[PDB]
Design an enzyme around this catalytic site. Sequence first.
Site, PDB file in Angstrom:
ATOM      1  N   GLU A   1      -6.295  14.171  27.149  1.00 23.38           N
ATOM      2  CA  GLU A   1      -7.320  14.918  27.861  1.00 23.38           C
ATOM      3  C   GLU A   1      -6.900  16.370  28.025  1.00 23.38           C
ATOM      4  O   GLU A   1      -5.807  16.660  28.523  1.00 23.38           O
ATOM      5  N   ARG A   2      -7.768  17.283  27.604  1.00 19.21           N
ATOM      6  CA  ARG A   2      -7.556  18.692  27.887  1.00 19.21           C
ATOM      7  C   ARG A   2      -7.474  18.895  29.391  1.00 19.21           C
ATOM      8  O   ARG A   2      -8.325  18.408  30.141  1.00 19.21           O
TER       9      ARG A   2
ATOM     10  N   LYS B   1     -22.446  14.481  27.433  1.00 20.00           N
ATOM     11  CA  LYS B   1     -21.542  13.336  27.463  1.00 20.00           C
ATOM     12  C   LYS B   1     -20.999  13.117  28.867  1.00 20.00           C
ATOM     13  O   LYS B   1     -20.920  11.981  29.347  1.00 20.00           O
TER      14      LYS B   1
END
Lengths: 50, 99, 506, 49, 464, 464, 114, 47
Positions: free
Chosen positions: E185-186, E159
């Site tokens: 978002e991590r 991805k």
Amino acid sequence: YRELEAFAAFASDLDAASKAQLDRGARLVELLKQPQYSPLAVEEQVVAIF
Amino acid sequence: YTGSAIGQHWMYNGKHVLIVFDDLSKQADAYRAISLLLRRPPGREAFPGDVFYLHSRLLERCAKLSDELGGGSMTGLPIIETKANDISAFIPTNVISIT
Amino acid sequence: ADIEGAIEDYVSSFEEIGTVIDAGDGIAHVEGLPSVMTQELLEFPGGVLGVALNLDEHSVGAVILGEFEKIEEGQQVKRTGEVLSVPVGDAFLGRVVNPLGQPIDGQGDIAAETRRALELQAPSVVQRQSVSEPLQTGIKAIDAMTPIGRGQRQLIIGDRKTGKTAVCVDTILNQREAWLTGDPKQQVRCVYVAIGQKGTTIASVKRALEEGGAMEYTTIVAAPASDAAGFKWLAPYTGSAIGQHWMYNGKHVLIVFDDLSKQADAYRAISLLLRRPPGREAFPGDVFYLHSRLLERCAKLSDELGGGSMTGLPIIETKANDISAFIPTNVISITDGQCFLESDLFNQGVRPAINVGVSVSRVGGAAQIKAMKEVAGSLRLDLSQYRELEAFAAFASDLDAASKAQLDRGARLVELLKQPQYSPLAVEEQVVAIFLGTQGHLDSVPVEDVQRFESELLEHVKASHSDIFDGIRETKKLSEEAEEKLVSVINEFKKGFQASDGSSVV
Amino acid sequence: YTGSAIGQHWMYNGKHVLIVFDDLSKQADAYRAISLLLRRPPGREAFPG
Amino acid sequence: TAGRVVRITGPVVDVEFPRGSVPELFNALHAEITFGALAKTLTLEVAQHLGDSLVRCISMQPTDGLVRGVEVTDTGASISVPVGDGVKGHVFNALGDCLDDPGYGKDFEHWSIHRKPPAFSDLEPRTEMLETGLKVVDLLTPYVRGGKIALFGGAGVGKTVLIQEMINRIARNFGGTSVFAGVGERTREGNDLWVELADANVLKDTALVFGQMDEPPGTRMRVALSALTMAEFFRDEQGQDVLLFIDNIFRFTQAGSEVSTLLGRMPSAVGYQPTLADEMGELQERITSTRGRSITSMQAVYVPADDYTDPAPATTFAHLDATTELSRAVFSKGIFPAVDPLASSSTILDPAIVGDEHYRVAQEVIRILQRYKDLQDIIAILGIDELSEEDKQLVNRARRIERFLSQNMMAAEQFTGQPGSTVPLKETIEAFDKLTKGEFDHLPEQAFFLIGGLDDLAKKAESL
Amino acid sequence: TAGRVVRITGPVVDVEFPRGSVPELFNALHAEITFGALAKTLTLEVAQHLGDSLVRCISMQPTDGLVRGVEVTDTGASISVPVGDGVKGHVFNALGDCLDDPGYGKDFEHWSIHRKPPAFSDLEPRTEMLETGLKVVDLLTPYVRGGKIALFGGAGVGKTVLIQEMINRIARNFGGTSVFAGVGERTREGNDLWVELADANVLKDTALVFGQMDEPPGTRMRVALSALTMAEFFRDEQGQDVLLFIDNIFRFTQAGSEVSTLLGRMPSAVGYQPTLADEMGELQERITSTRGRSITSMQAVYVPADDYTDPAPATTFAHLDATTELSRAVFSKGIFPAVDPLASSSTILDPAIVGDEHYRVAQEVIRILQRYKDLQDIIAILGIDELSEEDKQLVNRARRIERFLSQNMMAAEQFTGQPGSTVPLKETIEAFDKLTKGEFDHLPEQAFFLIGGLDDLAKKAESL
Amino acid sequence: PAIVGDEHYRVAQEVIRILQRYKDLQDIIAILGIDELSEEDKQLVNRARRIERFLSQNMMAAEQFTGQPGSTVPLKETIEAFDKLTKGEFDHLPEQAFFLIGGLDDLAKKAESL
Amino acid sequence: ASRRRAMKSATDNADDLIKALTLAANRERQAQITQEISEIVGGANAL
Ligand SMILES: Nc1ncnc2c1ncn2[C@@H]1O[C@H](COP(=O)(O)OP(=O)(O)OP(=O)(O)O)[C@@H](O)[C@H]1O
Ligand SMILES: [Mg+2]
């Protein structure tokens, strides 16, 4: 026809009457298909269904 | 209701109207938003109790008037977006019982 | 107009001591304290402590940190002046502490090196570094198919009595070899945060670690079920504070939270008692923020900040294996990978009961040593093929030869991944074990004997051919010379292996 | 409760009684109605705690 | 003129202002946390007017350490994000503060993140297709210029590599720009994306806006709008075609729901905010093509419980024009971009919009691949020898078709040295027409791996 | 100094006191009801301080007849219960008032019903097996001496019958003190237990405390604590081995939930109080044993809506060393005691404790039953003959194992008429080893039904 | 039976039994079809389908939809017809004959038509 | 051959049944969430 086709999807063989029904339905469904933005006047609809 | 009013003006003047609603599912969701922000306790599927009313009141004004009132008509073609062919859901069943 | 000016003067007019106007169910409302700050530590007359979580224009809604029954209306509340903080240092290794850092093991006081606020911000994106070194759990399944790298958040998610605490305690125990070497770059420290567990279960975890020798590098932050909801809510942040003090000093930390499902319940209780609006499953709107703020502390710091790391192993208990519940969804989205432990596999004899498949580690190969990555690369596909072909165990006779070979290989890889409790395997032993299976050397062994064959061959290599293990540990890859020697040792051993059914192996 | 009282009068006098309650489910619904009209906060299934 | 904090309930803060100076909705206020350990300048976004000159606001930073009666200064405008070519190549948060070079961008032009979608008369009435240059996308799942594309996948299915590919292609082919809205978002994944984009040297063509999970729900809810404001500036002012990534949109919805719960609203449907559709429309309907310039969007959508009828995806999918599903099976077969030809779909793939020949070729490819997938069970369990001659011929066609859907992606250049390919759509249609008619079914399977079209196919075949 | 009832709402009563005399939390207040038919002294327990000198209290007796403004006196101490060897052989209610001999305990030492659990320092894990004579319990879920045992089950699956059977099996052959806590259960079961204990001459060593379901919520909350206070007196003040049977502990939490909304607490999960985990932990951690002094606690747990995912059972599972999960499916199949072999677990089922021989047989039985559970789906629809030969033989073994896990229990003579049986642990291990190995595969299924051991199995097989 | 009579009650109970058995067999009918049932159950399901379809009727209010005029079936004829159906006297006729038919005589008419 | 056809039909019917049951289970899951939230917020509104 919508159920006779499902039955025939796995029936080993079909009688002549069932074959006639299937062959008529496979053409009626194709007849009712209609392209987008292309309406048909009632006269043309009745002729096509005829 | 704006569309229904526009159509009804012509309907009662003796003219024929065709009213489409793409989609009354999104009206039900909108009214759910207003009703919940007003803190009206929800019912089925988080909808207010009068959600049925919201639609019937709407779709019940699409009528073929008598000759005494000009003979006008308004034909309704509401659009409902079912979710995974769930024709037994709440809003679909309501609008099928109205239409 | 002048009325507004007088009101402005009156409001701008404001030790500060308040009065308890309302108390009950672990929450006390404190009139006064105009200069109290959110999450400030309040102290009550009986030595009780509270956290000012709500601040209205009328009163301060404070959650009482245990010993609640001593609070009465009208008691004088005094503010500490500082937000929640916990002591931190090397003295916490081998100690059991309540979420405030006060020991409960009954031994001496802890020599705190510093005090850390529980709400210090996590490392920013630019202060971090790619997770690139393994954290060997000792569980063949995890280290072979869902690797945990230092700085990763790996969620052990599963139903009750499925092997979660066992997996985490095995992970903690496996760090003993890295501890004894004395190198801070290999030396891994552990903090086991017990939330809502019964006291004897925490004691049993302590016994398991101590008998296994892990307690010389492990800290237990205990918030038993008896302790108030405040402790069950703060314990993860106390553990994270200790781990962060170790992490920013260059050390590598492993934080186990057992279970975050019980922290969410405690926070839900506190919030509802505080009349905060509830969401789904009655949880407050900031439960996801709660767990994210908890787990985003775990990271690997850039070498500019010492290069330390904190690896999280949050345990969450599902119900009816419903991973779609609110807390499971939040933690799954938060964490970097998931070990899904299932009861059906547990009963079928898979131990630890990891559903290889749905279970995934997003860090992936970057968290495996080269040896494991090379040997264990084909394991996942082989197990997938076996799980697809298992329906043909009844009609194998009609299968193609290749399909039969795949089925036989998988039926032995699944046994290969089985592992007894509290028996973690060093990384080299795992490499050799996965080599035995992926290379087909188990194809000649009965499926009933793969486990014992593995154990005996590993013991034989340890006792007599330790060169392979030393090579793997020093080089991190299985060299071709070592591979040939290992194959020769496997063949020599198979001649002297007594199968359970009396058959022979060639 | 009225039926139970009428039966209990006989019961405490040394006589045997047989009480039938068709339906206790409709009693629960009625109690739910009373509680919600009294504005007691309901429990699960909207029933009184 | 400044207000006073009167209530602190977690992320929610109530601020009392003078009778004549209450801030309007969605204004950004600044409140100081002076405690040494947690010193901060909270940005509070006004969410409601409670009356008596009290305004209820959602704190964009943790409120720990905030004191009642602390001064709150109104900024007089909504949360304003920096805009301009200077935002490219940097990483920002939901409030416009630069995260890698703090203080950067404070001198740029600042645009309010709350902006109405384009006027009705300014919308393009015909859906134009976005010729990505990727065989699989341009053939089977054609993207819609100014549309939204679902991006299913995960780790280990490329991805990130596909995101790099689309950044490269929009930057070079269309001369455009990309904005990556990392909602929820991590932080580890944010740093990994930042360093990977820097290594690929595509960060210079991309502006990153990370609403990290560790931040309260307000920032995770407003980061998508901030990134979309940057994209709108690149569209309307710079006159560039923009590609706005959102990872993850479901997390934007979830942040909206969490904020709605915090503000006291009664949840709807499955616990989502009553205004779910309104927020989703305010976000997505700003992603459109106007005045010849378009903001295309690739959005990673998480379907909870694998349920496409859940209100989150159900509302999201009402807006998505195409779907790209990356699969582990295709990725392991060595095929990059790793798009599953069958699971992925596009709503522009009708003979009315794309050409009749394009639709015919795409349908033939889909039919061949479906038949191959059906025969995969037989092949795996009984072996290819059991298949009939017709079935073996179809399998040979399908293997090469699915391998030709692979492409030497631009993002792969850094890892391999060879330049990436950009096949014109006509060439893709012709090549797949030939492949389904079997004009190349005699070539080795290895010939079709990672090649840029038809001439490259011939050259690699001659090489083999 | 005395208070004044201000507001009465079911079992909750608000009492207004003077400023300097507000009772402490968990103190016991006394009111008077003077109506002739319901005259009594009503004991209230302070649960909240509402401010302005108002306290809010739970009523230990029904508030029917209570009048606003009636005097309320403060006892100055929490509800206290008698303790000592005197309590053994007698029946008490939650307040410590003896039932079979009114006024019996008024001169004994009285201990506060509320007290902190033992410190973590004193706790030590228990790893000694308690052989009970039941096949299923001894094999699959070995009970822990000095540990905590639970009997989970839906509505009416045999919790009372099984707990009575285990009273018979443990207490009747046990030299220490025993305590029974009838928390919110049927009064007929309690009366039958009292009569049985009197007849078996075990009552003299048993202290019974009943707060059965006819009592208001307060009594159901506090009867468990009263019985448990007697238990901890026997533990700490006499160093004597103690059994604490509680039937049914869920009623404590349920009573908490009944007064949860009247106390002003917002509901949580499915209608439960927010303090579910806190309260139940406070109660449970007192039941634990401390090193050198053991309480063998055995507490039935009710599963509302027959749903094991309900918050109360789910939160109770964490406080238990051994768990016998009864199920309505097994009960409907006719396999009494109705234990679910798979969902049930015990922390002492470790090869390092029960021995490898016991563990191997237990795990083989679990594996066979799990495979049978998986196959039940195929069998009901496809049929038995369509299984693999190995799976068919395993299904036969599994049916026989399920029916052998059934046992003719001593307390279930009324269910079946036939007398009970005691199966030694070694005989159980041998029998189930043989079953898993197939030495009894040739016998009919009914030979294993309600049969207590191998000799009785042979007798039944010869009878059939 | 004290109100509608012994014959009416008996026929109604037998019809309900057949339909309940058919509903219970739906779980297998959906997957494997009629072929895999036991012969007794196979016959039961055949006459159950015929009963289910015979309970259909051509109503007068349905004319506006179908055109076919409605039909009235007296109680005695209904009882006799369903007694015959349960006893299996019509298991040889095609299921299509029982759609919207309303009567034994008209049933024979449609069967002859088919 | 008849077994092949019958089992293909059975697999298709089982797949359709799985789809229908997954839809039903998702509907019931959403309904349970909505009902639980309704109960929670109804208790909240009564305070
Ligand atoms: N790898 C293993 N091999 C054999 N037994 C195991 C293994 N892992 C766990 N067990 C056993 O499983 C049971 C439960 O293990 P554990 O304590 O890890 O459960 P858990 O998932 O943490 O559950 P909980 O804390 O909810 O009770 C114990 O009997 C433990 O001995
Ligand atoms: Mg555990």
